[PDB]
Design a binder for this molecule. Structure first.
Ligand SMILES: CCCc1nc2ccc(N(Cc3ccco3)C(=O)c3ccccc3)cc2c(=O)n1Cc1ccc(-c2ccccc2-c2nn[nH]n2)cc1
Ligand SMILES: CCCc1nc2ccc(N(Cc3ccco3)C(=O)c3ccccc3)cc2c(=O)n1Cc1ccc(-c2ccccc2-c2nn[nH]n2)cc1
Lengths: 372, 385
């Protein structure tokens, strides 16, 4: 009965988008208004045991009054003969449809000190072109790990910003600038290792990698601000999008493409580009033992990237579909929310892995390649 | 027996030798080649028509075929002995001879110091002007404003490649960055050049849509730019030019039909990069012009100003991109065999880096056309309506 009224509201929503005349739009909105009023009186199979006078059955009923109110606004535009305006008011209904632990701080700090220690070891031992990318990656990793105490304290006050709205934009962007600079230098490292594997034959690339990181962190500086979430009654540092569902889905999609898809394309093309070349050699003696060892070092950098960043990017794509209206079951939406800070920690863990993948096995890679 | 038709025969049978399983199949293709090579030695190149037959240019041409016939006879000696794998290996050596021909019959000392300086003086300016846009959006905090950001980002990435080309041109076209960078930076250049053009189009459609009166368009514009830069990614590679002793980053088309590919790709550059975009820019301008001329004394001053802003974006596009696209169409006809005057061909080559620079200059103009007159367009449009 509840799935039968929401199917009607979601069916006609698609109709409004594919409609060309205002008579088509008014017809779908009339079928919606009736279904919204008919759904307002029904009890869902999740709250079928619940009482009608409960505070849960005070706000969820109020939610429909908002939905009917938004349908009437769209109806007023359609009756005036305003297709583009009534179709725009229908996009606001999508946003209404979507609206319908001590271990975490300890874990943020334990990986902070470790990551700072292993990366301060890289900067000091370094103190070649490949070695110039190691320094920059170690610097970008060090600055990213340095922001961990801030997010640990932010979570200790259960999502509360007490540092200022300027710090929300400044430290918010600084986080994104170094996260991308770390990802984009991992890519440089994979392209260089591939270039050396094929042919044994950098003051422009390093400033470009920082410029691309500055550009990719501009929506972070444009949207991040201290806001009051009326739902929880708290002051949080969030992406203050204009009146919102479209922007959250669009930005979630940009996080995956620039931060995982495009980088992983490169990491994977370089690994299989190194695997194909070293397989065409056909080694038999101790060279078969040597080629396998080189291949293991090539396999490690691509496998460590997907172990550290795939859990978070999977959660981000699932969240994007929620704002689109694909996934609507609140039970599944709650799981994404709970798992999110553990997925965010794996991203920071990649900075602890990096010294072992490139610097600590740097000399070994070149010596075993010049051998085969 | 027209040299080009003789090369088609030599290249056709080369493919036959590779797909052949018996020595009788190989000897048959080599016999057809030997005849075609002898028949091409008596022919005059479709550009050396003016030059005498005893000239040193005509001497190396007839000599290049004596090498080619000599290599065919070596392969024939193997095929007659019943040596398929050996005759097929000798056929791979003909490929090296055919490539030494196409480099010559299809200089770097045309160098000017002015070109690298001009590439840098517009790089810093463009970068500065585009950063100003990015920073002013930051200071400020619309759908149109979301296309300004993307266009500025595309422009910034395109300008960032100018030091690579001002350096490549300075080493008389000797690529010292690596063959991987030739594919990577070659495609990156094309990806952002199209993304800049395709977002100019979005901006003109939006300004027209508002004059009469999105989270899907921006990713599609980048996807269309990715697709349009696939022939650059597939063909850009470092190739050795033995004549100059210089490794150059060039479009490595199959030498089997190299002239056909250069003409076909030159035409794709004009349709996707100028014709289709210009159709939209021009339809939107005259679409806006038709709306303001319909629907005064005091109210004519304001409408004229709005039309001047509409006229600027279409006129700046043809000033920046028409010189290069004209040169590209003239070059396509050279590959076809239409224009054969080396005097006229030399002019295209000399003018081309300057017509290339105008394309990059469009990125310096863009901040003045959309961001710096952004507020003015909306305030004067909400006035007339
Ligand atoms: C190495 C992990 C990096 C990382 N560290 C984080 C640390 C803390 C927070 N959280 C949640 C949290 C958990 C514990 C305490 O708080 C925050 O409250 C928060 C506050 C201010 C700024 C930023 C985040 C999330 C992340 C988080 O998602 N990430 C990943 C990440 C980052 C930015 C972008 C990004 C990229 C392009 C365009 C826009 C954006 C963006 N996303 N949010 N704003 N801007 C994409 C992925
Ligand atoms: C904003 C101007 C953009 C621009 N910058 C360029 C910068 C440098 C070079 N030149 C010549 C030069 C001059 C000075 C120093 O070197 C190069 O040597 C060169 C080297 C590697 C990659 C590319 C170009 C040319 C151009 C150049 O023609 N263009 C215009 C352009 C670009 C690509 C395409 C294009 C579109 C669809 C399919 C295929 C292609 C294509 N063309 N060449 N490869 N791929 C069409 C027009």
């Amino acid at each position: 009965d509840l799935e039968d009224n929401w199917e009607t509201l979601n069916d006609n929503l698609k109709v409004i988008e594919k409609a060309d005349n205002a008579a088509q739009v008014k017809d779908a909105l009339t079928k919606m208004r009736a279904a919204a009023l008919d759904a307002q009186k029904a009890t869902p199979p999740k709250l079928e045991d619940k009482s009608p006078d409960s505070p849960e059955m005070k706000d969820f009923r109020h939610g429909f009054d908002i939905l009917v109110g938004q349908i009437d606004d769209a109806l007023k535009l359609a009756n005036e003969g305003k297709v583009k305006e009534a179709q725009a008011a229908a996009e606001q209904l999508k946003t209404t449809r979507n609206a319908y632990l001590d271990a975490i701080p300890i874990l943020y700090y334990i990986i902070f000190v470790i990551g700072f220690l292993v990366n301060i070891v890289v900067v000091t031992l370094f103190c070649k072109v490949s070695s110039i990318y190691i320094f920059n990656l170690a610097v970008a990793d060090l600055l990213l790990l340095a922001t961990l105490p801030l997010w640990a304290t932010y979570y200790s006050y259960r999502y509360d910003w007490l540092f200022g709205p300027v710090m929300c934009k400044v430290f918010g962007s600084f986080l994104t600038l170094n996260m991308f600079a770390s990802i984009f230098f991992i890519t440089c490292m994979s392209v260089d290792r591939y270039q050396s594997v094929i042919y044994p034959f950098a003051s422009y690339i390093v400033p470009l990698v920082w410029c691309m990181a500055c550009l990719s962190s501009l929506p972070t500086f444009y949207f991040r601000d201290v806001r009051t979430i009326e739902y929880l009654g708290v002051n949080a540092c969030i992406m203050a999008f204009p009146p919102y569902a479209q922007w959250s889905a669009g930005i979630a999609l940009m996080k995956n493409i620039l931060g995982f898809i495009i980088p992983l394309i490169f990491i994977a093309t370089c690994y299989f580009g190194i695997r194909k070349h070293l397989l065409k050699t056909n080694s038999y003696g101790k060279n078969r033992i040597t080629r396998d060892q080189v291949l293991k070092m090539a396999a490690a950098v691509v496998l460590a990237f997907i172990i550290c960043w795939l859990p978070f990017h999977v959660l981000t794509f699932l969240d994007a579909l929620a704002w689109m209206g694909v996934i609507n079951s609140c039970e599944v939406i709650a799981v994404i929310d709970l798992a999110l800070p553990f997925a965010i920690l794996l991203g920071f863990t990649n900075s602890c892995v990096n010294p072992f993948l490139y610097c600590f096995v740097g000399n070994r890679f070149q010596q075993k390649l010049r051998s085969v």
